[PDB]
């Protein structure tokens, strides 16, 4: 499954995943590719926050679904 992750800058990361994979695993994939630690990343699908201990099939995320990586802004 080629899911897309959308960021605030508009950057898009295509991840190869399996429906059984957990959000924690998806966060670990993004960490290895972009260096963003999983504690600092909010995955969001259809306006809802995704919990680490749950799977993609539970949130009904499919082949070309696009999640959102929303980062904490401080200044």
């Amino acid at each position: 499954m080629q899911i897309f992750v959308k960021t605030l800058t508009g950057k898009t990361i295509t991840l190869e995943v399996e429906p059984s994979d957990t959000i924690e695993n998806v966060k670990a994939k993004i960490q290895d590719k972009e260096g963003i630690p999983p504690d600092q990343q909010r995955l969001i699908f259809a306006g809802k926050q995704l919990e680490d201990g749950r799977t993609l099939s539970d949130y009904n995320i499919q082949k070309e679904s696009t999640l959102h990586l929303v980062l904490r802004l401080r200044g």
Partner: protein, 157 residues
């Protein structure tokens, strides 16, 4: 009607995202606020508090304590942090503590405001934007995120 022509994708109940393409200086006036660590609140105090002062930011931080008591337990960006209300207020109400996305969400709820954070590239071109609230953008509070480290106020021109 460009800013109104901007389309926002909902990533929370109170939060939306967008990928706009424009230079913030063409549509906004930048009011630079000091690099004291309290500029998020300094940039909000310029746009919201009618009486301008070097200590108007404190009034914004005090309004934030009421807002955190009301909404921090139920805020999505607060579920990520391992912090609970009393820790957050001690950390956040301190001087040189950086405010931003989490603080803007609770303030938008408690003050009935729509807050838009525009992010720039070092040439004043927007790399992205976040809006807290779904109100009109001509009544919203406009904040500039220069780098990922600084906040200045924006007034519509």
């Amino acid at each position: 009607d460009f800013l109104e022509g901007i389309t926002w994708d909902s990533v929370s109940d109170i939060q939306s995202v967008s990928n706009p393409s424009f230079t913030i200086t063409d549509y906004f006036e930048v009011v630079r606020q000091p690099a004291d660590g309290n500029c998020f609140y300094h940039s909000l105090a310029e746009l919201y508090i009618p009486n301008k002062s070097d200590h108007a930011y404190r009034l914004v931080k005090n309004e934030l304590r009421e807002a955190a008591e009301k909404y921090f337990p139920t805020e999505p960006e607060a579920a990520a942090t391992g912090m609970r209300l009393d820790e957050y207020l001690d950390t956040a109400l301190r001087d040189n503590e950086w405010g931003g996305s989490l603080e803007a969400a609770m303030l938008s709820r408690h003050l009935g405001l729509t807050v838009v954070i525009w992010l720039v590239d070092g040439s004043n071109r927007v790399v992205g934007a976040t809006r807290f609230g779904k109100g009109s953008l001509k009544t919203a509070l406009h904040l500039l995120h220069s780098g990922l480290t600084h906040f200045d106020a924006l007034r519509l021109l």
